[PDB]
């Protein structure tokens, strides 16, 4: 249960983006919109697992700039295949976060 304990005791939050045109822009956005947080990326080809400690924000403004075309926040759902953390979403951004620290 050492392995299991360590896997459970994480505070990783963030989007799982399915393969397509949102993968690189979301990675870049995570980096820009969470300065001073390290962003981890696990590439599983069909999807990419993108995470930060405790909280990870994606703003519409940054994502639009990184995507290179007009973008509404609600559209992220076309490519957001899963996520870690609780979600708080609005027209300006999406926030992945935990209430607790493990």
């Amino acid at each position: 249960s050492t392995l299991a304990d360590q896997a459970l005791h994480n505070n990783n939050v963030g989007p799982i983006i399915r393969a397509g045109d949102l993968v690189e822009p979301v990675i870049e956005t995570a980096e820009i919109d969470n300065p001073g947080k390290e962003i981890t990326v696990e590439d599983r080809r069909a999807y990419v697992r993108i995470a930060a400690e405790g909280e990870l924000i994606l703003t519409r403004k940054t994502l639009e700039e990184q995507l290179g075309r007009p973008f509404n926040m609600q559209e992220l759902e076309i490519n957001l295949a899963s996520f870690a953390g609780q979600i708080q979403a609005d027209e300006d951004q999406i926030r992945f976060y935990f209430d607790k620290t493990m």
Binding site: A46, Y47, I78
Partner: protein, 490 residues
């Protein structure tokens, strides 16, 4: 100008009212609503965290489907069927059969909430949920339909849930228990939270990773698009759980989560486990089944459960041991009784694979390998009669899956039995027996396939009689070794 959703969203879910011409309980009967006596007023604090609205919904879902169908169309001549490893084709057959009409059944779970939940936001999100599952059911009938003309086993994308084939019974017993057979709040907890934030990621994203490695982008693209819907409507469960906890129903909520997770686990161990560690070609195994479990169920899902205020399930340590052991045995059972399946199981025990298995599960060769050693010897000496069964496996009265254990050098197998209302039941684990005892009226007069076999419901009372009962309409439809035993040559 247009006004932003935040400014009018509350009015879309301002739909609770105080009944006057019928009673509150008549309008929301407990057996269908599952409100646990919590009054209407309390349910108005329900706040779905993943919102959508009708205009956005139809626009965005239009775009999702356009992509899914365009990719399928562009890749029709990629020779996936002809050029793929037969183990991969069997993975498609198993997936579409076990999932397509269950997705359509999930419409009804969502519908149960849309009508009977006392939470206005839940009723609206469940309406989009109804629509999502309709999409998923129709996609996963449409996509395999073109393969009907190639292989009668793809007929089972439609036929499986209409059959008494043993895996189809396991699927229906689970989905009818957590989706279609309980009150709205139980659906919110067991389906949208437990199953849809927990386990479906294994089959619709874990498997997508393997599909991408296998070069089947039509399938990988399909199931990952489906999961984007899942990710939205699954977020109906969390706020329901938080509301139950706030209103003094933590224990009831925890029990439902515990039950649903275990039931989902046993089903996915027989469906997804063999796919990820045996059917999927070695070179395409992105991660092992256990590695994917630790990513998706332990690392992501169980951490989310904790964050919402629930506890680790009581059976935690049993669960962890099971991840090391159960699917290896379920795989062995599906393959030895392959003739009872609608797909062609791949054995997956060439030396190269056995080295991988030993690395991913230290001790495998001294356990399951002892069995595969015997089987492999018989194949190499063309004693094929010893590689086909002449009796039925004993079956769990909960999961409907054969009763298994650890074979080989440190043999251990346990059946957990129960006398109840003058009948003897057998369960494949402590937890399965516990699930039964949480709600005997749900289960007590259900007869599993072997129960039926013993009670004279299957005629003739032979393996062939059983195969017919399971709905196989031609010899072609019954499972065979994926590679016609060509693996022995290695």
């Amino acid at each position: 100008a247009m006004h932003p959703r935040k400014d009018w969203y509350e009015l879309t879910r301002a739909t609770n009212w105080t009944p006057s011409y019928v009673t509150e309980e008549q309008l929301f009967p407990e057996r269908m609503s599952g409100h646990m006596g919590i009054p209407l007023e309390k349910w108005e604090s329900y706040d779905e965290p993943y919102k959508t609205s009708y205009p956005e919904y139809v626009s965005i879902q239009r775009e999702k489907d356009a992509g899914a169908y365009s990719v399928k169309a562009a890749l029709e001549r990629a020779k996936i069927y002809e050029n793929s490893d037969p183990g991969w084709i069997s993975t498609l057959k198993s997936h579409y059969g076990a999932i397509a009409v269950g997705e359509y059944a999930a419409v009804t779970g969502e519908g149960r909430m849309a009508r009977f939940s006392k939470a206005p936001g839940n009723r609206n999100m469940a309406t989009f949920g109804m629509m999502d599952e309709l999409r998923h059911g129709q996609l996963q009938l449409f996509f395999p339909h073109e393969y009907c003309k190639k292989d009668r086993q793809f007929d089972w994308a439609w036929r499986a849930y209409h059959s008494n084939e043993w895996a189809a019974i396991a699927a229906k017993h689970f989905f009818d228990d957590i989706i279609t057979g309980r009150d709205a709040i139980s659906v919110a907890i067991m389906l949208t939270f437990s199953f849809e934030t927990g386990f479906t990621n294994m089959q619709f994203l874990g498997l997508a990773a393997d599909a991408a490695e296998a070069g089947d982008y039509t399938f990988a693209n399909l199931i990952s698009s489906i999961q984007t819907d899942e990710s939205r409507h699954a977020q109906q469960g969390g706020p329901a759980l938080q509301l139950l906890i706030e209103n003094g129903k933590r224990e009831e909520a925890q029990k439902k989560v515990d039950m649903a997770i275990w039931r989902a686990w046993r089903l996915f161990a027989v469906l997804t486990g063999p796919v990820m560690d045996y059917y999927t070609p070695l070179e395409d195994r992105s991660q092992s089944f256990k590695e994917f479990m630790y990513e998706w169920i332990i690392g992501q899902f169980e951490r989310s459960l904790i964050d919402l205020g629930l506890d680790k399930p009581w059976y935690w340590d049993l669960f962890l041991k099971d991840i090391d052991e159960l699917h290896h045995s379920y795989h062995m059972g599906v393959w030895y009784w392959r003739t009872t399946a609608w797909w062609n199981p791949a054995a997956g025990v060439t030396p190269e694979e056995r080295d991988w298995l030993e690395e991913k599960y230290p001790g495998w060769n001294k356990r399951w390998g002892r069995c595969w050693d015997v089987i492999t010897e018989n194949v190499l000496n063309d004693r094929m009669d010893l590689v086909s069964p002449e009796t039925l496996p004993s079956v769990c009265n909960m999961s409907q899956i054969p009763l298994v254990g650890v074979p080989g050098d440190d043999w251990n197998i346990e059946v957990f039995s129960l006398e109840h209302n003058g009948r003897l039941y057998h369960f494949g684990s402590e937890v399965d027996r516990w699930v039964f005892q949480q709600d005997p009226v749900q289960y007590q007069n259900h007869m599993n396939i072997v129960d039926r076999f013993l009670a004279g419901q299957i005629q003739p009372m032979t393996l062939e009689g059983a195969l017919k009962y399971m709905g196989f309409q031609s010899i072609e439809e019954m499972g065979k070794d994926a590679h016609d035993f060509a693996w022995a040559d290695k």
